[PDB]
Ligand binder design. Sequence first.
Ligand SMILES: Cc1cc2nc3c(=O)[nH]c(=O)nc-3n(C[C@H](O)[C@H](O)[C@H](O)COP(=O)(O)O)c2cc1C
Ligand SMILES: Cc1cc2nc3c(=O)[nH]c(=O)nc-3n(C[C@H](O)[C@H](O)[C@H](O)COP(=O)(O)O)c2cc1C
Lengths: 105, 106
Amino acid sequence: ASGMIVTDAGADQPIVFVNRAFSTITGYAPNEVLGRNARFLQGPQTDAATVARLREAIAAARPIQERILNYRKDGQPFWNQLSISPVRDETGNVVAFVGVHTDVT
Amino acid sequence: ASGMIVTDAGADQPIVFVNRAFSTITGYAPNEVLGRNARFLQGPQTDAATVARLREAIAAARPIQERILNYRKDGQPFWNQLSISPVRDETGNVVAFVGVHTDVTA
Ligand SMILES: Cc1cc2nc3c(=O)[nH]c(=O)nc-3n(C[C@H](O)[C@H](O)[C@H](O)COP(=O)(O)O)c2cc1C
Ligand SMILES: Cc1cc2nc3c(=O)[nH]c(=O)nc-3n(C[C@H](O)[C@H](O)[C@H](O)COP(=O)(O)O)c2cc1C
């Protein structure tokens, strides 16, 4: 099953919602991630260039997909196939971001 | 501000998340809507042909935009500029639906 992360659009894109599969994949319960930026999933072997592409895409509200090394709550690394898209209203304002992720280890 | 509704993909699309603007626009608190299909926003002056287009688009997981007459919790009508899109994983599976809505009553 594919995880889903919804964040606010501004400040530092705090997580406001995760689905069941997010917890299955990452080992984190919703209560311990809500209000945090999803970058806590990253760790020592995460590719910095991949992180920088995500950072630029979110800043510009551009859709992006990456395969990124993430870490479960218990510290185990896994390959996360991640897609992020902005959610926009009719006037083009960004309301939220939505991420979908799949463990492709 | 623009409301956002997230629903499950399956089983008549129950609401799983709303943002604060959803409550400002509709008068419903999250507790009052979680687990329900968003059609409780409709009422007797809602255009049946618009509802049909929504029904067919959601069943097909096709993005759709419509202006639809909706009703606040206490019954006040408002025009809802609504856009609904599926959320897909890399294999194309629909994970959720996301709706963004604005009160465009003149
Ligand atoms: C909706 C959404 C979902 C995200 N999901 C993930 C994720 O699953 N894994 C990850 O490493 N980063 C994820 N990110 C990216 C980080 O939150 C952050 O944007 C990224 O690391 C770049 O920013 P930084 O350089 O400030 O950390 C997500 C971001 C958004 C907006
Ligand atoms: C994510 C999402 C958000 C929705 N938001 C609204 C809304 O704001 N107003 C509305 O009248 N219907 C909304 N709907 C549409 C109804 O939930 C429903 O799909 C539509 O009325 C057609 O179905 P029916 O004939 O089975 O009621 C939304 C649906 C989804 C999936």
